[PDB]
Amino acid sequence: TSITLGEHFDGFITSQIQSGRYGSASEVIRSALRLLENQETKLQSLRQL
Amino acid sequence: TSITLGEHFDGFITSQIQSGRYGSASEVIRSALRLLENQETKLQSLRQL
Amino acid sequence: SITLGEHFDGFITSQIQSGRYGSASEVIRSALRLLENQETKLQSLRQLLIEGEQSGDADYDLDSFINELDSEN
Amino acid sequence: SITLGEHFDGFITSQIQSGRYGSASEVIRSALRLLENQETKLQSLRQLLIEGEQSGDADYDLDSFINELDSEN
Amino acid sequence: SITLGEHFDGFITSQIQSGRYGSASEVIRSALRLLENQETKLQSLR
Amino acid sequence: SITLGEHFDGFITSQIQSGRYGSASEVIRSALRLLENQETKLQSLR
Amino acid sequence: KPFNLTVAAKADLRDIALFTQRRWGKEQRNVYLKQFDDSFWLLAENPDIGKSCDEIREGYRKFPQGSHVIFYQQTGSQQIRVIRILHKSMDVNP
Amino acid sequence: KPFNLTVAAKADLRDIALFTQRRWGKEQRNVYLKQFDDSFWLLAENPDIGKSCDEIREGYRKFPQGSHVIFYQQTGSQQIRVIRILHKSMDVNP
């Protein structure tokens, strides 16, 4: 398990873990994926036939 | 560079790359981090003194 | 292949340089996701209008509606 | 340490089991982020009200306002 | 560059088969225009 | 469990020093209540 | 008489009324419902005030009203039929 | 006369008017501004209709109006002062 994120995104994650509002580097990605899943699951209008 | 995401989140990413709307596993995390950065940057009311 | 123009080609390059999108395929896929979501939204609005118009005309009056709402609670 | 109750302890466990939050520290940190964002929002609304009230009273009339808006464009 | 997924390769053809778009170039540029408009809504909130 | 960051450890004390909350337990439970209300808004959209 | 709503439109109006009542109050809800009744009479007495939206559906017109958007079809010179009162889930698509 | 807005409140109203004009039209903007003028007169003739919000600021009351929320302080038995007309950036905080 590994991903090749951009340099800007790595800097963003380091700033988020240095901001004190996030604990580990995986916490940031977990919050981001939470937002993304909330977005995609909301798109259940796709099942309108 | 590596993260330890949850089993539910790994299943979600595999479903997003099997949905055809995302190309690689890193693409999903990049979109999620885009959403997260749009959220955090919007919180520039913090600088209101 | 395809041809978009200096506007969008320039755009795609600036979006890739920003570090938010790895590949040009990635940014084009994000745009296509946006367009597909808007199309599904359009079809959902259309089906809402359909299910609203093929329902019955309802007897509506403002004060009678308010009296009904007051009788509910 | 702290004491929250069977409601929140149960909640935290169900949020950890869902796979959306790894640690209990993580879910408590997400809740604290929400509360801090709401506090900053509250202070921003307060400063908006302050900067609005310590500004001058403006001469307002509906039709004069509409005439001014029409004279703009 | 043109290495899209089968889902998008089908969606572009399905929406050009409607008659509102010319070909894949126009649908891709309109999608990129939606994306640029969303990015511009973020630029007002720099 | 109680291994929070210095930012949150300072924020909880700063908001209990206001006089609207009792101690760290109440601020943490009100934050968790905001989180549960946000999750419940998602549950209507299951 | 010059305007009439559907069962779905009346259900939408009831949803909005109950929402604004549970959030703000009963008198608020009454003021809000009086405002849309006024908007209904306005759309009836003047059906060309709503921007046309044939792209979405042929013949429909839409009018903004706070956080919702009334969709109505003109059924006469000064007669309209309100079909839906949705939120901001709508799209321009020019 | 029974109500008066601030420079910030007038600027907010101008922003909303220009937005609804650029999106919908000029007559739409006029109808929208007539609605808030009516809401202004209503809050003046009845200042206890807005839910109190001393928690946010001592003395202020808020009233919903579409996608925005009027904040006003009661300066008389039937006289009020409108200070801000923001969007949904607000919080209950009961």
From Swiss-Prot, chains A, B:
Coiled coil: none annotated. One of its GO terms (biological process) is regulation of DNA-templated transcription. Keywords: Toxin-antitoxin system. The keyword Zinc does not apply. GO terms for molecular function: toxin sequestering activity. The keyword Plastid does not apply. Belongs to the ParD antitoxin family. Antitoxin component of a type II toxin-antitoxin (TA) system. Neutralizes the effect of toxin ParE. This is Antitoxin ParD. It comes from Vibrio cholerae serotype O1 (strain ATCC 39315 / El Tor Inaba N16961). The gene is parD. The chain holds residues 5 to 53 of 80 of the full protein.
